[PDB]
Swiss-Prot record:
This is Immunoglobulin G-binding protein G. The chain holds residues 304 to 357 of 593 of the full protein. It comes from Streptococcus sp. group G. Sequence repeats lie at residues 3-56. It is found in: Secreted, Cell wall.
Amino acid sequence: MQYKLILNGKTLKGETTTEAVDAATAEKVFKQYANDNGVDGEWTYDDATKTFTVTE
């Protein structure tokens, strides 16, 4: 499934996508990516457009 990520951090914003099977896998991928980008905040999920938003 095509999963989207919205980085809404005070010092890092943007949007990216990944081909992930399950929501858990998608969140794991984005979790590693975001955390490696230094963005660890609140994680919101929208099931309409398959989008995770990280609020920092």
